[PDB]
Symmetry: C2
Subunit: 192 residues, 2 copies
């Protein structure tokens, strides 16, 4: 495990400077202080190394959202949504290189695409359930189907966070993204 961790830390550090294309199995072995065949004992490929890194990041966010769901903030509905979106902003924003490369690999990799898909379905379902609960309590109006509204809003966040972290043009500055997403969540969830 200590050497497995080494390989993962090396991959994360290198992904800060280059894409996964420009990183070889030899670069990973070298940084982890192991040989090439020893690398292949822990991981079958550099793609599997990414997949593991991405799995850790996605579970960290998922576990943080579970924690929030169990310990609701004693706060207004705007800060409720802000606290939830902030899980993603801080989690992925603390692992931008992994996040970016994990998104790029969605195009090439079946398991990476499936990992993203699974967790997106889960977070969408949760969002939809909160919206439904808000509607049942009379705080939000019955406008769009909750699960479609949840899907769009979650996709917005994915795209917008990714663009901000990558400093794409165009993008919302990183110091304005949370406010910008929360406004659009709150107005569209509560707006008649």
């Amino acid at each position: 495990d200590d050497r497995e961790l080494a390989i993962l830390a090396t991959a994360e550090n290198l992904l800060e400077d280059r894409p996964l294309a420009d990183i070889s199995v030899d670069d990973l072995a070298k940084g982890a202080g192991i040989s090439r065949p020893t690398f292949y004992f822990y991981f079958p490929s550099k793609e599997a190394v990414l997949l593991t890194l991405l799995d850790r990041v996605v579970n960290q966010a998922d576990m943080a959202l579970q924690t929030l769901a169990e310990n609701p903030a004693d706060t207004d509905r705007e800060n409720m949504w802000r606290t939830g979106i902030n899980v993603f902003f801080e989690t992925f924003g603390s692992h931008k290189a992994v996040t970016r490369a994990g998104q790029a690999a969605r195009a090439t990799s079946v398991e990476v695409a499936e990992l993203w898909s699974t967790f997106m379905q889960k977070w969408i379902a949760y969002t939809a359930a909160v919206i439904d609960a808000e509607r049942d309590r009379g705080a939000a109006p019955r406008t769009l189907p909750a699960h479609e509204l949840a899907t769009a809003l979650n996709l917005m966040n994915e795209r917008t966070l990714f663009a901000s972290f990558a400093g794409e043009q165009p993008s919302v500055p990183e110091a304005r993204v949370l406010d910008t997403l929360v406004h659009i969540w709150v107005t569209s969830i509560y707006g008649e």
Copy 2:
């Protein structure tokens, strides 16, 4: 030009069945009824063929939005936004294979990334100007900075349209996407 058009039509037809990776210069020449070296006279690579296809699609949408801007519908503010979003839905939705592959190539191709960036900046700027005009006339409240609000909403549409057209999981069904986006535009633009 007739042979250039042939190559483009062949590329568009093939991209319906495979990604650009699985299409070779030989497949393109073959479908256009030309030789391989004759192909290289018209285009330097299969990437340039995509780039041309994508440029045509993006300009078609841009010209449609210009047309709308010059001939405003005599309609309420909700149908105003719907008519604009619908330009993208119908334009890109009529060229899904090109649209999808053009998005995939953003990761690999500098010119493709720049083409998308240019036009996104333009459509964001336009959106922001309409929002500002709506605020000046007192129809919309001064909430978020207009250009940040415009950026998020345009990124939402990009991601959501792409997912819908690709039938990703998760996605908004294609027959519900326009309604879903328009709701979120209108509530967030006009919602206090």
